[model samples]
Structures are given as structure tokens and as C-alpha cells.
Target: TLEKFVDALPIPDTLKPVQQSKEKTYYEVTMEECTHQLHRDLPPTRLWGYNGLFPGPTIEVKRNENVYVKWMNNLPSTHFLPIDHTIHHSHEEPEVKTVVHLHGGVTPDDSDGYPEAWFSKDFEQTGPYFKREVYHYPNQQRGAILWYHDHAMALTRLNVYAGLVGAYIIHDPKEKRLKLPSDEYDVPLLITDRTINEDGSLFYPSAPENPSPSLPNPSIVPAFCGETILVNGKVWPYLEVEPRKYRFRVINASNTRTYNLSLDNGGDFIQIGSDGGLLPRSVKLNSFSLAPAERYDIIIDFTAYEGESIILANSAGCGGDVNPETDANIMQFRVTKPLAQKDESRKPKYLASYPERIQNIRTLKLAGTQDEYGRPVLLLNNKRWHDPVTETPKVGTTEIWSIINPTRGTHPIHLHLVSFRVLDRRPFDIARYQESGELSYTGPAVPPPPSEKGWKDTIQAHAGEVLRIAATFGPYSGRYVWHCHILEHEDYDMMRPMDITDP
Candidate 1:
């Protein structure tokens, strides 16, 4: 098929703030129609990019900094990607809508990127929940690797896939003492999956399998796994590194594909952080799982393996086993560069340092049903997106959310605004629960592994298991959302609004 490792890996440039002062920083990013060569051999493919760059520019800010982003959309009136009008509210809305969601951001409701808060091109039109043109990010939480993407209602999958994602890093001054990799050594790898046609156009399936006569022309598929892999907007690219330590902020921005990654040379990754930020302690692993919207801050030392080419391989399958020549090979690292000023970073054993029991326990279900046309519709608790909100948490209070997954697939469940601690997981009898609505435990609760013990905003709730996590509703919360991070599922109706009342 398409070429692999023929191009050099692209490192996204850091975005410079348009205006900055001691009190706040201001930036303006616009969504524009653009084209860029995804691979060396392919022609420039059409895409909608933030600031006209695929994968956008990485924005870095200091912890406790007040940042404002006036995210504007200047794309065409109609979307080039296939649109499923069958999805909720999409039928009556404009063909192109955009909303910037700062995933894992601890911000207020108005700027949380509420799905219904989307706006049309140049703010010509706005959604019902639209509030302001400038979105604010009060970086109050711990420094973590976060990202921003489109969160428009019903069109999240299409918008995001169309090339609207970027990395946002919050640097804590206190972390300086950790003496981790600094400038030029720290890189952000945004992993995404895409399907490109031979003629240089993107291809997104418009119809589901075994299309019924009653189904709409452009129906939404239950799930999607793209045909190719793109790391930082390049197809199977390669990076040359010096025989030293490097910090990689790995963000799984893929829609549905979950990657189980490992180094071909059997080198270990010192994982120092998770979605919500630095882990309490570093965990050395030969391999790790990265689901959509998950971020793993890892350090790979090529110190011992100079002049060797290490392939970052993926063993996880999307629809089937990864093709050895294709998806299985993520990228290559040629540790051939000479020593770049003796590696000064330290692989500290300790990374960082969470509890509450006004504890409200809420049991939620990850289930699915069929629409009128028989197309599968995944849901949270058998409720649609527009259903009455039930996950209302009191502000400044802690709650335990027990996610019950009776479905057959794993869902990367994510909660916005706050990070949580993984409580534990236990198996349950799905058949028995479905047959009689009885609670039958198949196993005792097992604690999370050392890797997942840190603060996390996104977690994988596997099938036939009850995954529980404890989170405290924050200092500033008005409205937020919790949903399956799988973009397709989130759009079709798996997301729900979470209102944080102060009373």
C-alpha cells in the first residue's frame, strides 16, 4: 500500500502567545481549510487544520497561568468529510460546526467545550449553549500533558478526524528540581489514525455494514479503526536521536484504535506521568497500553544502545491483527547521533504524590442498543445525549463513580475537568445481570497496577468488569461532560452532561 518510514518525523512547533503579561496570556487560533503532504509520495491531501497546520502547533504554558484562546473557525460552509445526518441534532444544524475542547483541562463550565456550545464559521452562527468567543484556561490543577480538539455535537468524530487537534502542556516550576529532560530533548508525539485514498483524499466510511434499505445514506458506524497510522502527521516516519535520555509526551489522539506499544529492541520505558499528570512513582515497563485521549509521559534512554535502530512496534489490533509492514510498525528510532552534551537528566525513582468520603456512589452502565434503522447506538446508562442529566455532583465534594461495562468491548471512559484515582475493578456475571438484574460478583476487587495508580482522567473499562474511580468535584465547575472517549460512540450518544451545582 502506502509508503512507510520514507519521511522524517515532524516535531510540531511551539505556539507563541500573541500577547502576554504577568497576569494573563492571550492566543488566537483559527480553523482553516488547508492541504499538506501526509507522506512523501502522496499528493497534498485536503484537511481542516488549526492555524492551517495539520496536528496544529503545540502550546506550552506554566502552571497557574491564565490563558485565553480565541478559537475561530474559518473553514468552508460545507464539510468535505462524510456527515451522518441521522445522528442527534445534526439533521437541522449547519454542515460545519466547531468547538474547541481542552481535554483534561480544569476549567469553568463556559469554557469546558460543551458539545452544544459549538459555533459555525467565523461565529456567524452559534449553538444553544454558546457562551463566549474567547475560551479561558485557568491552569490551576497539577501540570499534566493535555490536548485540545473539536468537540462539536454529533460531528466530533468528523471534525477531529478532519485535523483539529494539538498538544497543550502545563509546566510546573516545582518539577524543575526533578531535572527531567528539558528543551530540545522533550518532544510531543501526537498519534492519529487515518484513511487516505490513492488520489490523495481522505476516506471516511459513510455507511455501516450490511446497510439496510431503511438506513440513511450516511449512517454512523458503531466504531471506526482507520487503515493507516500517522505520528505527528507523517506516515511511519523515523527520528534520529542521540544516545541519551529523551522525554516523550505520548498522546493517543486516535479515535478508536488502542495501541499496545513496545520497543522492538526490548528497551524499557520509564513512565513518569499519566493523563492527569506526574505519577506518584515512576514505573518501568517493557510495554504499555494507550487508548484514545490517554497521555503517557515516558523517558527512553538510548544511552546503552548507540548506533542501533529501535522500532516502536504495536501489537494491539484494530479490526484484526496489525499488518507487520503497516500498523504494527509505529516508527523507528535510529540512535546514531553522537553524544549531545552528556545526558544531564536523572531517571528519578519518585515522580510525585490524592481522598474524600462525603463519598457519593453512582453506578453507571456502558451499554448499547439499536436505533430505528437498526444501526447500533452506544450509550451510557441506556440514555441518549439529550436525556435528562442525572450525573449532577455537588461542587467541592468527592464522589465514587462505578462504571459497569456489560458490553463486549473496552471503552475508554473519560470525565472532564477533574482527575481521579483508580479505585479497583472486579468481574461480574454479565449474563446473569442482564437476565435478572441481579448483582453477582465473579471475582474480588483487584487494585490497580502501579502504572495506573496515579491521577487519571481517562480509564479503560473492560467488558464484564466494574471499574470504579474516585474524583472530587473541583474549585470551579459549572457544567462538564463524561463519556466514552471513543469519538464515534461519543457522537452517537454515549456522552452526558455533568452539572456541578454549588448548593
Candidate 2:
């Protein structure tokens, strides 16, 4: 029954911030509903959490530290998932909106959770950029693995599929003076995927009736996948470890799986970081590909596999889902514990990645096509989020973008507040960039996979490929967003907004 809970590995309780004031640091958090038991044998699932802890509490700060949160929206006003109001701009409310978004923070622009900035619950109802319930994080960028969740406009795929998610960490005493792997051997995994209902409860997709009847809008659904890979929330999870080198960090809080990772035991690991920090060095890999809020930081050594176990396999590549090969399993590491202590941590041939200074290049264009229920529908330079933003730039300078995907599926884009650096991924000629728009190429460019050479706020782009990032527009900006993290194609119409200004 759900792999008998696959035993250990949960680790996520650290929040505690009620107050502090060297200038800032306060917290309140709250969003109820709890029953969790993901799988020790199924059947306890009610979900949705923050203080009730399903996947919440992990905040941990200290890299310029500034905190200040309030968030609170005490839940139970209904909605345990399955609310699709044609998504994006249909708030069919019962008063259950939210708006946390700290994914890759450097936040600001009304605290940047801006999916109309939802509110509901203690505040009854708010959206239309609802402003204060506290928020203000200003950790000023330079620490890795960040996450928060619930970006409410068209319900970020049902409030992150009924469990608001969490994990923040920032630390940086120049990366603790390079002595990596600290406390309890450093870990954070957080991967996700869920499914329930043999009386276990949590399963999304309610039905507007469509297995495609020539499809034309059964409320435009299609993209809430799940087959259970779970990790950090249990179900097929495991982790005892202690042969040696640890430091994991993972974090693909899935809603649209893509993992690819690899290591059933053949062995080899070392990606030191990605998604806005670290990685200017490490990068050894034998398998890697995460996408969906992205975030990887790897480094597993298990000191030459002691008693031997380390599973962690998932070649399940970019699925659109149905059965999706059960997502090829994921999680395990029975090192059996033996190395006692004295592995001080070391491995930093220099990791500061921060050099982009650009001036301008732009080019967007992710596009999709078809939505009278024929599904697809995405877009970006093909605009719509009410169009007209067109990327802006200026502020502290540095830009290059270029994106351009072509679509047949495989998006993972994500970018909110500054964090970009891919510089390469070329294979052009999608009908000559879709009928003479120009990019042309044809093949050979490659480059970004050394754990993606550092900083990145999500980037998977394929189907025809072009990618090319570089970004750096300010130490703080104004509007913000770059979309396609597939929260169902960012709630329909793939998203677009980018306004940094003031040169």
C-alpha cells in the first residue's frame, strides 16, 4: 500500500520566526487542514498546510537576513482541490485565495506574489493586487534553494495541489566559509507528486467531461499529474545515509514532473547548485534533469557506498501524463550509517557565479496553439496576460533572453525576480524559426549543463530549442514574471510581464 510508506526521510520542520528586530525578522504563517500520512499504508490524506505542517515550515534565513512575514489565511473555507474556473481570471470564490510566492526571492513589486495577489480567509476576500499581510523578504539574493508556493491567480494548479509547499534556507557567511554539508548532514529534497482516493482522499481533476469529445472547453483542463514519487513527504521515500559526503537540496515540488535524475547505484554525483546560486565549479553528474520549480545543489558520496543501497532513479522524462510509466520510482539511500563523524566538508574550486552585465537582446516567443479545448493554448511573446508589457529591461542593466521554444511539450521556464545565466542551447530552424521569423541555426550550440553553469530561476525550454539567457536588471525592480512552470501552463496563456525600468 503505497510502498508501505517507504520508511524514513521527512525532515522539514524549522520555521519559528514570531519576532526579531535588528531591523526585521518576524513570521506568522498559517493555512490549516491536516491529516497527512502520505503512506505508511495510505488513508489519512486531508492535506493543505503551513502551520499544520504537510510540507510547510523550513524557512531558515541568514544571508543579509530581513524576513518579516504574516501570510495567514486559516483555511477550511472549502476547496481541497478541483476548482478550475476556466482558471486565470475567474475566481469563482468561496473565499479561498492565497499568494505567497518567494520562489527565487529578491522579491518586491507588491511583494511579487502577484497572481492578482490573493487573500481570502482572515481577510475575507481581496485580490486585484491585494497588498499587505506583511510579506517583505529582502534577503537581497545570494543563497540557493528558495521556495514558498501558492501563487493564486487562477489558483496555482489548485494552490500547489492542496499543500502549499515550503522550504527557504539562505545562509551565506560566504557559504559558511566553504565548509559545506553542515548539521545533520545537510538535506532538503522536497520532490513531489501525489494521488489518493481509495479513501485516502487527495486526487485532483473533477471533470467538465472530456476525454476529448472534439474538445472545446471542458474548462480547459489537462495538467495536474501525479503517480507518486513523493520524497520529503514520504511514500516511496527512504534515507538513512552516513557513509560520507551528503548535502542534497533537490526541490522539484512537482505539478508537472520532469526528474530524469539517476543513480540506482552505478554512482557519480556532484552538482553543487543551480537555480540562482552556487555552481561555478562542481558539476560531475552521471544523471540530472529536474525541472518544475527546479533547484538542485547535489553532492552525494555515501563514502563509497557502505552497505550499499542508494536507489534514486527516475528517468521519467518530461511527461504530459496518463500513466507515464509510473514515473520510474525515486528515493532511497540505505548507507546504513557508519562514518561516525569527522568529514568537515570541502569542495569549492570557486563558486560565486555572478557576471552578466548585458545591455539588451530580448526575443521571447514561447507559443503554443489551440484551445477550444483542443488544449495546448500557451504563449508569451505571442503575449496575453493582457499583453503590452513586452519585457522592459533597463534598471541595473544586463539582458539577453531569446527563449523561443516551438512547443510539443517540455516547458519549465520560470523566472520572477532576477536569476538567469544559461548562455547557450541552440538547435534552431523550427521551420526556420516558424516561417521566417529568423533564428535559423540548425544544430550545435549546447553549453549549459555543468549543473547549468550557476544561477537560474528555472529553464528547461525544448521542442525546438533556442534558450539563451543572461539577465540582471536591478538590485530590485518593479513588475516581474516570466512563466511556464506549467502550473498548467501558468494557469492558461503561459504568462508574461517584465518591467524593470529606470536606467
Candidate 3:
């Protein structure tokens, strides 16, 4: 057990845009392996990352600018984790191919980084839908806190687990002038769960026997949620902060874990933004919940405390709150530096407005059953990823979707390239609806919690609850996806394609 804290908090390097202009910018990123000491008491751990650094650098760009990134794969032929060929189109020898998906980016079909557009080392062979080496980002959407990670078909879980994740931030003139805690005080925290082996390597389970006996590799895998918490790539790190306000861009980069974050020292948070940025109003909260692939921007002030510490802890909850103090807490915050300079940042009173009408309403459900081994096989509307695309919304049309959940674990539904607002959530008889194929709303619609009223790219659809959201598929549209944020489920065909066309 670690008795003392010695590992310093890690800060990701900033990837500077090579070309500087309002119309365009360029970035060249390479994936490689490097050794870094994780826990203070453990040895150096080897991980795959960008530019040989874990929690890859943060790429900052301006709104309405064009950003281009060339993502290269330099990883070894083999993966650090086990490969499950039965996961999807996986086969005997797994390919280390990878395609960079801007988690919340708004881009054209060519630059959207489709899951099947992966490529390997030196560009030897490309995927079926391989586009090109250099991907262009129009950056035409509003400013928000977005991220990028591997999206290889059936291998996203493994590739991302190897530490191939980074932050992509777009700044608007309005958000910039908000006078928020910025620069060094504006911190980016990439939080994820992981495990280590005796040899200081990552521990990820895989297939024990390929569903295809012909291509069996003796590996098995499941929804992985570990006990070890890593913030910004350090194992249980503690940050030294000044006694003033600080803006934290928090991203839940875990594969299959949900965190109910709260401060240990009774510190409150001023949540001002989510994945799409800038909430309608600053909502004060004692704690909040974030599912995998979700993001939240909050502010905390430490000017009231000195020579003391605070901890960011997570309350476990998959369907409901299971436990607290269940695993490694997020990290510690020590107010060590004294505040000398005057803090000038202020939170704005109004943010963005929501769309009022809906052009199309769809009834979607999460369905599945257990296999012979009793392992859950999740599905999207009883459809596989290869199923003929059913969601073809007209471009620039506002659509309303009522997501009915009939699953066990909490599902955080995410739709790419479109940010929406949760209109309401109501109770319903799922079993009855599933059996009869009818509309059965048990009660009236309840408003969304104050802290969750912002523009959201992902929203939790709790069990037995019908969550309704309205979104305008505008600005730009081609091919995108909306699926459960859980990586294990998504990789195994719990995702589908939505093609956008002219109205």
C-alpha cells in the first residue's frame, strides 16, 4: 500500500499548431511507446501514446478555423491487451490499425474518422473505407471541449486502453472573454480507470477462446472497470494549487465506468459547461455524475483554505449508487501556493439557447439477451452495426428522440456531430411496451435537473426511464453515430450508422 504521496501530478504537453492562420492550421501526431513511473512506489510502466507521452497533448484551436491532423500509428504489431476475435470482425491475428475519431468533433465524412477507416504502420494496408493520411477538421461548430481517441472497428476498447487519448479544445471569442480561470490555472483533467500487472505493464482481459474455433487465439474480454484511478496519466496524483479560483476541464475517459464526483472537504463546484460548452447558466452543485466519454467544465475556489487538502471522490453507480470509497479516489488538491495576483475571471449570466420545435420523433430502445454463458449481449434497437442504416435524418431538421431503456446497467447515450437538450424523462412499463409494441407512458414528463440543462452530446438513460431529447442536425452532416458510450458494448455491435441527406 502507498503510505505517502510523492508522485507529482502530470500535465499533458501542448501540441502547437504548425501553421498559424485564421483559415487553416496543421498538426502531425505520432503514436509510440514510452516508460513512465506511475505510482510513487511502483516501477516505470510502459504505455502507448502520442509523441511518446501519455494523455497526449491538448490541441487548442479557434472557432470557425480549419484544423488538420495527421495521426500516425507507430505501435508494435501486437497489442498490450488481449484480443477477442469474436468481438466483431476480429480474426486470428489482430491488426494494430487505428483511426483517430474526434469524440465530439463536427467534421465532413472524409475527416470524421470512420471506425473502418483504420491504417497500420508505414501505411502498409488500409481499411475498407480508408480516406487518407491527413484528416481535415473544418472546426465549423461552436467552441466546446472535445477529445480524440482511437476508433478502430472492434478494437477501440483495446487501442484506447493503451493510452491513445487526447484533448481537442476550440475557443470562441465570447467564451474567451468570459474572463474565466485560464492559462496555467485552467487545468485539463483526463480521468480513467486502469490496472497493472506484476511486471509493471497494463492488465486488460481478452478472449479465452475465439467464438470462431478456426481462428481461436485463447483470449476473452468483458466490460472492464478497474479499481485503480489515474488522473492526467498519474496514479492517484495530487495537484498543488493556489488559493484562488481554477477552471477544470474534466473528461471521463474510462471505458466502462461511471463516476459520481464530489469533494471530500465540502467544496462546491460551479459547473459552467459540458461537452458542447457554455451552459445556459452557471449551476452550483455539491457533486455531479459523469458517464464514460462525458465531459464537464467546472470551477472551484481554494482561497478560503490554506495548508489543507481536498479530494475528488467518486460514488459508484452503474444503475444506482452502489458504493462510495469503493476504489482509488480521483486525486487530492493541496492549496500550497499563496495567491498574490488578482483573479479577474467571472462567470457569464447567459449562455446558449435551446431549439423550440421538433421535425421528427423516433422511438428507440436498447435490447439484448444473455448467451449460454450468461454474459450479456447488448444491442441497439435489436440491430447490429452491420444492419442496414435506419436513422437517416434530413440535414438541418430538428428531431425528437424518446430513448426507452430496458437494460441493466446505466447507459449513457451519445450522438456524434450533434448536441441536443434533454426535454424530459418519464417512467414507463418497459416489459409491457416490449411485449405489445405500444406506447405506454406511466406518468407525466419531469424536467431535467438544473445541473444537466446544458447542451449535451451524451445523456444517461436510466433503466425503465424514457429520456426525450430534441436536436437540430444542422451546420454540417454526412455520416455519424449515436450509441451507448460504454466501450465494451459499442465495440460489440451496440452501435449503428446514421446517414444525413437533403430534406
Which candidate leads in lDDT? 1
TM-score attained by model 2: 0.33
Each model's RMSD to truth, in Å? Answer: 1.2, 22.4, 2.8
RMSD of 3: 2.8
Which wins on TM-score, candidate 1 or candidate 3?
1
Model 1 clashing-pair count? 0
The regions of model 1 sitting more than 4 angstroms off are 90-92
Which candidate has the highest TM-score of all? 1
Cα miss at 98, model 1 (Å)? 0.5
Please give each candidate's TM-score: 0.98, 0.33, 0.93
Candidate 2's residue-wise lDDT over 104-138, tens digit each?
88877788788877888886787766777888887
lDDT score for candidate 3 against the true structure:
0.80
In order of listing, the candidates' clash counts read 0, 2, 8
Question: Please, what are the lDDT tens digits per residue for candidate 3 over residues 1-503?
Answer: 44224566888878987676766788999999788777877778988898788899998888877789888988888776777665565323336878898978888776777887888886677887787898988887777889888888888888888899988888887776678888888888998888777667887865432345443353334477765788888887889998888989999998988888999887899898888887878888899998988899988888787778888887775434554453537888999977758877775566566324677898898877555444566888888888888988889899999888866557889888888888899988877877897768889989899767878888989988889988888667677778887888888667888887775
Model 3 CA lDDT for position 181? 88
Model 3 residue 212 CA deviation (Å) reads 15
